[PDB]
Every structure is written in C-alpha cells, then in structure tokens.
Symmetry: C2
Subunit: 277 residues, 2 copies
C-alpha cells in the first residue's frame, strides 16, 4: 500500500512513534481541507448502534460515541461496547470528519462544529451524554465544551474512557511502542495513507493549548492493568482527569478494557447515568 504506512511500521519498529506522528501532522498540512462546517465532505449522520426501552424514550439521556483518532478505526469502534446498551439506552456513534477524498478540518473547532450540528439534529430534544476512549476521550471533552460555549448547549454529561490529557501523558510516552504496535495489531485492513494523515493532524490538534473546560459532570473510567512495564516510583501510570464526578476502575489495559471488558465499561456507565438522573 502506501509509503506512509510503511514508514510508520518502521518508525514503530525503531521506537520512533512520536517522531513519525509529527511527520504525519506536518504532511497533513498539504491536504485539501474544509474551513467551515458546512464545507465538510462527509455526512456526519450519527449511526444508531443500540436502542433504549420503547416504554421510556422521553427525558432520558442518549449516549453519543465520539469516534477516536486511530487510523485503523471507524464504524467498528463502539460495536462491542454498544451491545451492552441494547434495551438500556440509545447509543449513537458520530464519525470524526476527514476519515474514510475527505477534506481535513482546518482546525479542530471547525471539525467539532460539524459534529455538533449533526449530533443536535439526531438527538432532538433528548439530553446528550458524550462518550470517548483514549484520544476519542479528549475529543469527547473538547466537543462537550464547544457544544456548551459555541452552541449554547452543554451535554448532560461526559464519559471519558482512559483519557491521557496533556500535562500528564507520560505513561503514554513510555508505552509509545506498544501504542504503535497496537495500531497495527488492530487493522482489519491496511491503514490508508490518508487516514494516517488525518490521525497525525488530529493528534497535533489535541496537543495544542485548549483552555476551555466543560461544565458537564465527568465519569472517569480507568484501565486497571498497565499496557507496559512501569514501575510506580515515577508516579501513577493510570489515566487522569481533573475533578471527576465519579471514577470507575475496570479490568484490562488501555486496549483490552474496550474489547473483552467492554461490558464492565457499560455497567459503570449505566450505573453512573442512573445516579446523575
């Protein structure tokens, strides 16, 4: 396939994941982009992946999965987790613009507006709870705030699954290689060069200074097993968020928490939603 994928595979083998992510971000600058939400390529129509109880569909929060940055991801991302929401809550997955041709966002705000427009449309008057994993968790928070500040519509809550925000993603750097190896282990097919570019541009967006903090209550869900050797003399390897409303620990690592242990993620969510309501 593409040269970017082959270069990345080598960088990962050489333990230079971070360096190549910078190269992707620089190269993404030369892709055509959209400078206004209404100029976005794709239909950002959210897909219904689970349906809540018909007896009670009116006043209850609906869940919206915020697709993460992984170049190997897309519509498969919340398949496993969503199953556990069937007959409990509507679960809607919103695509991240610029993936599976597609113009890349000029800046993050522009992408977030396009998602906001599409989520408000599908959700209607139901309160929204945003959910994301890993970089998708950082995206879920930036979206929540944008919704509050730019659209005057704060979500009723945010579920952040293993967020590593700037100021404390040191374990994520030490686990760099395992992170890169995890991208390759997860491909159902070769990651396209265009999607690697989109990943690099978003990673760069997410490293930048974004001081807006959402007023929505946060559930912080954390992996219980380390992805790699750590050694706690350095401090905590675990995911972090400032002042969470509730924290739930679940089995598995940064990656396995979302597959084999997805039901435990779902159970903490459902239980947190009942309390909040």
């Amino acid at each position: 396939a593409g040269m970017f994928r082959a270069l990345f595979r080598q960088a990962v083998e050489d333990d230079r994941y971070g360096e190549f992510l910078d190269v992707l971000a620089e190269a993404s600058a030369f892709r055509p982009q959209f400078a206004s939400p209404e100029a976005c390529s794709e239909r950002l129509d959210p897909v219904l992946l689970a349906g809540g109880p018909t007896d009670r569909a009116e006043g209850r929060a609906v869940l919206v999965g915020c697709t993460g940055t992984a170049a190997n991801g897309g519509p498969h991302e919340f398949l496993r987790l969503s199953t556990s929401f069937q007959e409990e809550r509507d679960f809607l997955a919103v695509p991240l613009p610029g993936y599976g041709t597609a113009l890349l966002p000029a800046d993050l705000d522009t992408a977030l507006d396009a998602q906001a427009r599409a989520i408000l449309r599908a959700a209607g008057d139901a309160p929204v709870v945003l959910l994301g994993h890993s970089g998708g968790a950082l995206l879920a928070h930036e979206l929540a705030f944008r919704l509050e500040r730019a659209h005057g519509a704060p979500p009723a809550g945010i579920v952040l699954v293993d967020p590593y925000p700037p100021g404390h993603q040191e374990p994520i750097e030490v686990w760099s290689r395992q992170l890169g190896e995890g991208l390759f282990a997860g491909e159902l097919e070769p990651m396209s060069d265009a999607r690697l570019l989109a990943m690099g541009r978003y990673a760069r967006f997410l490293a930048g200074p974004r001081p807006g903090r959402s007023s929505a209550p946060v559930l912080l869900v954390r992996a219980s097993e380390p992805l790699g050797d750590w050694q706690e003399e350095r401090g905590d390897w675990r995911a972090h968020w400032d002042l969470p409303h509730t924290v739930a620990d679940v089995p598995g690592d940064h990656f396995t928490m979302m597959r084999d242990h997805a039901p435990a993620v779902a159970e903490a969510v459902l239980s947190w939603l009942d309390a909040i309501e």
Copy 2:
C-alpha cells in the same frame, strides 16, 4: 500515484515547494538505508552515452555526467546533451544511489563513495571530468572533492551547469514553483514516492555545510534568460560559483539550456576541454 506525489502536486499548486521538500527530507529518515558504500543495494555502473574518436586512444579526458536529484529523472537526463559529444568525447552517466526499495544513503559521503568506486572501475586509466546541471552541478563538485581526498584520484576538471550553491542562491528559491511545475511536466510516468523521498534527502544533504573545495578547474556555464519574473532591483538572478576557471554564457533559461540549447553547452565544454 502514492500520497507523497499527491501532496507534492498540491504543494506546488499552493507555491510551497520549499516547505514540502523539507517534509520529504524528514520522512526520508524512516526509509531503510546503507551506511557503508559497499552496502549500496544497486549497481552504479555508468552507462556510455557517447563515444570518442575511434582515432585517438591516448590520455584524453572522459566526461562523466553526474545525475541530478530530480524524482522524475534517471538514465535519460543527458540524452540530448550527449548527442553533441558523439565522435568528440566518451560521455558516461553515473546513476545517483537511492533511486530506481533501493536503500537510501545515510549521508552524502556514503553515496559519493559508492559513485567514486563505480566511476573508477569504468574510467580505467583515463582522466575524468565531472559535469552536472543545477543540483547535479552541486553533486558533481561534492563528488570531485570526494574523488580527490578519499580516493586519491582528483578529476581533471568540472563542468557546473547553472549551479545555485548554498547560502548564495536566492533566485532559485524565488523560482520554486517553476521547478516543481517543471518536475511534473516532463514526467514520463508518475514520480514514485520512494524517489520523491530520495530527492528530499539529497536536497537536504546539499543545503548543509560542505567547506571542502576541489582543486580541479571549473567551467561555469550559465543560463541567459531568467526562469521567472525578477525585479531589476537587487541581484543578478544568474547561477554562480566561486572563482571558476572559465565562465560561459549560453542561450535559454535554467531548463531550456539543457534542451533546445544543449549544443551550445556542448560547444563550451569541448573548447574548454581542449585546454
């Protein structure tokens, strides 16, 4: 039709050739390489593109064309020019390593060594005169110095056709778009991503500090028409070299000098060699 060429196509459209060359150099670091000239993956056998007079078979210097960095280039770079050397001089084109899964050179010196070894094998006991055009002209000079100091075989002369050496080469930066546009026109086929990366890597080698000067006399051949617009204000737009043996001006621009007007470049070389 890989992504690097599509990005490069867009960069040239947006007048950002310089910036994108930097991205190619950066990305090139992640391609497999060779650290020793012996580890070079390809055969750098020079190809004979013109033959000298069957008559005289004495000393007689042999022209060695040092292929440039163009990702759309290769064995066809000197075809037009060499025609004018037929029945005058042997003309040999040496390939530039890393083009045509070819390992890229870890640094410039490693590439010049692999070239120096193949040139010596071909040139036998004859004197060698390097010739290069534009970035190939810079390469020709860096190779001459490498031949002289690391192979104990100093060339008998160097022809630098429209060179724009670092730190004092601005017009070629201002004519950026025209170069990128020139790469696309003239592609016999789509430039591969591996060759674009090779081009980026050499470009960066050639922007770097290289004090070593060759002892061989230089013929500086300069284009007569500007490639693009240029304010009569500050600056001669012309190619340049420090203290050349002879300077020769020929019709055409940076590009056409090697095409329609190649015979004029050839005339200048023959005359100069005759001394």
